[PDB]
Design goal:
Oligomer: homodimer
Largest sheet of chain A: 2 strands, antiparallel
Keywords (chains A, B): 2Fe-2S, DNA-binding, Iron, Iron-sulfur, Metal-binding, Transcription, Transcription regulation
Strand content of chain A: under 5%
Largest interface: A-B, 41 and 41 residues
GO cellular component, one term (chains A, B): cytosol
Strand order of the largest sheet of chain A: 1-2
Number of domains of chain A: 1
GO biological process, one term (chains A, B): regulation of DNA-templated transcription
Organism (chains A, B): Streptomyces coelicolor (strain ATCC BAA-471 / A3(2) / M145)
Function (chains A, B): Binds DNA; this binding is disrupted by nitrosylation upon exposure to nitric oxide (NO) and also by EDTA and iron chelators. The 2Fe-2S cluster is stable in the presence of O(2).
Distance between the termini of chain A: 28 Å
Number of helices of chain A: 7
Chain lengths: ~130, ~130
């Protein structure tokens, strides 16, 4: 599974990918409603997506916002979760623990490897 | 990342892999201490590992307990977590949501694909 935040940001920019013509006014209120979350979590996602340069804030996607690999975007959004959340793991000494930790980091990289090929435009497509 | 339970069971049978000679008496009390968790969670892991046939309970590993693929074992331990935990996800309608859900299930399968090659004996090894 993923991160609740990583999820949130993905859904958010995925929704901002949707409208491309003069469809409507969309800001943090509109998208906080749309993806179905409080405004407090959606400001966090919108801003961390502005700091990663996908959202230009006057809200729309940037060209960066559309051509970016999702596996990398997930790495960047979920890596901070790997920092904050995994600091309170503190597991005990077990024989072979680090050899597993190696394997788990690898399988995670395969998870990310399957998501590196695709963009947000691939997510919200229409053949 | 993984499941707290999946983790727990892995560490448990990994510890039961350790002693193979007449080293000591090991039961659910000993291993609940060893991997550093309450007895209440460790009985759940020990039993779900007996129902998956890796632990013979008179506690040791079975031959099944040693030659099993970990990617499959994780699939089986974390799949029930995919049932219980993901029932309370209930996400809202988003354009392209199911195409993502496809991708996320795939990347997960790549995560598991990297863990399918290895056993518990590979985890607790010694070249």
């Amino acid at each position: 599974r993923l991160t609740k935040f990583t999820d949130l940001a993905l859904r958010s920019l995925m929704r901002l990918a949707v409208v491309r013509d003069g469809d409507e006014p969309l800001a943090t209120r509109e998208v906080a409603e749309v993806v179905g979350v409080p405004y407090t979590h959606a400001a966090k996602a919108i801003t961390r997506l502005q700091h990663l340069g996908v959202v230009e804030a006057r809200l729309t996607l940037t060209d960066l916002g559309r051509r970016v690999s999702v596996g990398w975007l997930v790495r960047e959004l979920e890596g901070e979760a790997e920092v904050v959340d995994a600091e309170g793991d503190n597991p005990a000494p077990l024989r072979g623990a680090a050899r597993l930790r190696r394997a788990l980091r690898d399988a995670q990289e395969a998870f990310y490897a399957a998501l590196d090929p695709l963009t947000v435009t691939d997510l919200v497509a229409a053949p």
